[PDB]
Ligand binder design. Structure first.
Ligand SMILES: Nc1ncnc2c(CN3C[C@H](CCSCCOCCO)[C@@H](O)C3)c[nH]c12
Ligand SMILES: Nc1ncnc2c(CN3C[C@H](CCSCCOCCO)[C@@H](O)C3)c[nH]c12
Lengths: 230, 230
């Protein structure tokens, strides 16, 4: 039997996931998260929001894998755009992710690097290829690129410029890299999907509140379309 | 029957732990960590190093709890001092911890705060009381204070002074807050002990390299004395 973990960071990001799947979910509390466990097209689906940021998302992903035995993890949510071609509501799949706020440069380590790890964490090529295939069938744009994750909500030109110069990131959020990292450590295939909610600039807070609902729904709808192919 | 999880961040922090306990350990790999499982004084001890930083430490602490069923978690390692009275080799027990690099100020949150959490994460009062009691009996100085944790190695006066002014922190490291946080989420008693390796200033890299071994041993020796009373 196939077991698939579906994650968002905020409750608002999983609201449309639960609604779009529409099946009956059993609620299972563990480690301060609530896991929604259902069956859909012969697959067991386990849905949770982690809460915001790297520690929360690391915890929840580890719980998904260890406690619920998922074989794939699909993340859905919203993100800040760092590139002109990614506009509000546009979808991006992360081919690599970085923890942009990691700094061990005192020991001459490059920014983003931690010993016994790597700057860039890879996601599943087979899932990313699937995303590309179905986006083409749907005639919807889907960009591929690097996503930068850190424990700050980015809302300045200066920090955007750093993310582009240092990591060639296309989008910024606070959980993708930690989710992808956990999945790498456990050998679990991962896809990270984001819809743009803001431009990570001085107006980001306002844009985020305006577009969270729609952008979350766009990501969630696409995630469902991926699960339909598994 | 009592099962105690014992964590460091770096391999060097657990070397003296394994040595001082002296017992045979079984090595169990899981999620990119190696867990050393042994029996000491009729208690079961599970020792691991997480690897550096908040994501690594969150993962490992969650694995310790879920996969190995530990009832308490004790963290031992080194830290940078932020206060004049904490000198190289001095011991500190963290009564609260903060993630000092968290910034959701774009939405008017205070620094360190994440929704559905708190700036300050509590450790176990009963374990901190035990530490104080033993330290007094041993005639060893043990400070109680706030530890700030983040994904940067701190090596500047400016950042030191921020940690003191913002959080009234006494020491800085990269894992304590995340370990204590996971333990809080699962309702597992936690104690975080650190020995000072450096002063978190421009000389910190050199001080760290010089004193890592001795400071790690000092922390490990004290952690063993706690386990002897559990
Ligand atoms: N520009 C940007 N920089 C960094 N990340 C993002 C993201 C992605 N998510 C949104 C969410 C923000 C949490 S704060 C809002 C809620 O606070 C109020 C609720 O109490 C966190 O999970 C990261 C969208 N735009 C971003
Ligand atoms: N001032 C300071 N700021 C933040 N943290 C600390 C700590 C506590 N630990 C040491 C270690 C980082 C060292 S990276 C060594 C270079 O990598 C060598 C392996 O390639 C990480 O686990 C945090 C001591 N002094 C500190």
């Amino acid at each position: 039997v196939q077991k698939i973990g579906i994650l968002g960071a905020m409750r608002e990001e999983i609201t449309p996931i639960l609604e779009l799947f529409g099946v009956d979910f059993e609620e299972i509390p563990l480690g301060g998260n609530v896991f929604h466990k259902g069956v859909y097209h012969n697959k067991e689906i386990i849905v949770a929001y982690s809460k915001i940021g790297k520690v929360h998302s690391t915890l929840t992903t580890t719980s998904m894998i260890l406690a619920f035995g998922v074989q794939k993890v699909l993340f859905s949510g919203v993100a800040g755009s760092l590139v002109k071609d990614l506009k509000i509501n546009d979808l991006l799949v992360a081919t690599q992710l970085v923890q942009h706020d990691v700094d061990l440069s005192a020991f001459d380590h490059p920014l983003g690097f931690i010993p016994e790890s790597a700057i860039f964490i890879e996601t599943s090529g087979s899932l990313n290829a699937l995303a590309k295939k179905i986006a083409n069938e749907q005639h919807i744009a889907l960009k591929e690129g690097v996503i930068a994750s850190g424990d700050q909500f980015v809302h300045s030109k200066e920090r955007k410029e750093f993310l582009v110069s240092e990591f060639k990131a296309s989008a910024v959020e606070m959980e993708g890299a930690s989710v992808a990292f956990v999945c790498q450590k456990f050998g679990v295939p991962c896809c990270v999907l984001r819809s743009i909610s803001d431009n990570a600039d001085e107006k980001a807070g306002m844009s985020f509140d305006e577009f969270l609902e729609k952008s979350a729904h766009t990501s969630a709808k696409f995630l469902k379309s991926m699960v339909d192919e598994l």
